């Protein structure tokens, strides 16, 4: 089984073509934000009749496109993580969509077996990553990038880094890296069933960043009650440059281990 390794699990090969593969976590939970960001968003009629509260999702799953396309434990796939801030509670408004995040990925990964005095590099992942809001300007929000995903785990530990290299255009926001950086360092920690985690980027040159905790507790044997304390700058592309910190619970399909 080995929790927690993506691209092992992906070697796994599955029964059903319709049984995908989980990339990240999947959850669906409703959040309530410090500040709400009406200013790259005013071009919308709702913009000044925005809520601060909001329902947060985030879909992740992995196509194995080719296996064993460079050795016996590697593979070549692709991957769907989206974001998505939606104005449920917003009745007045029709419920719309403030903001989603579609980031494709296709990928090189090996599930490895290397020693690091206790911590074992199960993960070494190399692809390309696209992750832009669908939107037309103003609000256009979209960066490409070239990254690197390790992952290594050590008993209750799991340590994620993902550095990256911004390719291709970024007019939509220059500055991005700014806000972002240029990795995504990632913590879980697998206290009995219960599941703490962090995920942040920070940009040790402009003091600029993000980061959100989690704790999550199965319900049952595929649901999980998740909690989530994100805080800072890049929550979604269209506030990459804008700070706030957003509490939210509800559920959880698969936590990063
Ligand atoms: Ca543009």
């Given at each position: 089984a080995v929790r927690g390794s993506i691209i092992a699990n992906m070697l796994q090969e599955h029964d059903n073509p319709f049984t995908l593969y989980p990339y990240d976590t999947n959850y669906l939970i409703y959040?309530?934000?410090s500040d709400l960001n009406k200013e790259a968003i005013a071009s919308y009629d709702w913009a000044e009749n925005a809520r601060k509260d909001e329902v947060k999702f985030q879909l992740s799953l992995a196509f194995p496109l080719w296996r064993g396309i460079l050795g016996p434990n590697s593979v070549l796939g692709?991957?769907?993580?989206?974001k998505s801030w939606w104005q449920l509670s917003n009745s007045?408004?029709?419920?719309?969509?403030?903001?989603?995040?579609?980031?494709?990925?296709?990928?090189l990964g090996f599930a490895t077996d290397y020693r690091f005095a206790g911590w074992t590099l199960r993960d070494v992942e190399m692809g390309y990553n696209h992750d832009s809001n669908g939107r037309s300007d103003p609000t256009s929000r979209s960066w490409n990038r070239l990254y690197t995903r390790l992952?290594?785990?050590?008993?209750?530990?799991?340590?994620?880094?993902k550095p990256w290299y911004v390719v291709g255009n970024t007019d939509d926001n220059p500055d991005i890296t700014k806000y972002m950086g240029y990795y995504q360092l990632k913590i879980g920690y697998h206290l009995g069933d219960?599941?703490?985690?962090?995920?942040?980027?920070?940009?040790?040159?402009?003091?600029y960043g993000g980061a959100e905790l989690?704790?999550?507790?199965?319900?049952?044997?595929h649901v999980r009650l998740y909690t989530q304390v994100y805080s800072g700058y890049?929550?979604?592309?269209?506030?990459?440059?804008?700070?706030?910190?957003?509490?939210?619970v509800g559920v959880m399909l698969n936590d990063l281990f």
């Amino acid at each position: 089984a080995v929790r927690g390794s993506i691209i092992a699990n992906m070697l796994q090969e599955h029964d059903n073509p319709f049984t995908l593969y989980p990339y990240d976590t999947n959850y669906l939970i409703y959040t309530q934000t410090s500040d709400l960001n009406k200013e790259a968003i005013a071009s919308y009629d709702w913009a000044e009749n925005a809520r601060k509260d909001e329902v947060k999702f985030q879909l992740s799953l992995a196509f194995p496109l080719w296996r064993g396309i460079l050795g016996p434990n590697s593979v070549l796939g692709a991957s769907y993580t989206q974001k998505s801030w939606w104005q449920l509670s917003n009745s007045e408004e029709s419920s719309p969509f403030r903001e989603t995040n579609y980031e494709p990925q296709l990928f090189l990964g090996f599930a490895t077996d290397y020693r690091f005095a206790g911590w074992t590099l199960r993960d070494v992942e190399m692809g390309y990553n696209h992750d832009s809001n669908g939107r037309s300007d103003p609000t256009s929000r979209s960066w490409n990038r070239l990254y690197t995903r390790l992952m290594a785990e050590n008993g209750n530990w799991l340590v994620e880094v993902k550095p990256w290299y911004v390719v291709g255009n970024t007019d939509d926001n220059p500055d991005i890296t700014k806000y972002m950086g240029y990795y995504q360092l990632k913590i879980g920690y697998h206290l009995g069933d219960a599941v703490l985690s962090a995920k942040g980027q920070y940009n040790w040159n402009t003091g600029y960043g993000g980061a959100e905790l989690g704790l999550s507790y199965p319900i049952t044997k595929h649901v999980r009650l998740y909690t989530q304390v994100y805080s800072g700058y890049g929550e979604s592309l269209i506030d990459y440059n804008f700070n706030q910190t957003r509490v939210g619970v509800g559920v959880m399909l698969n936590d990063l281990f």
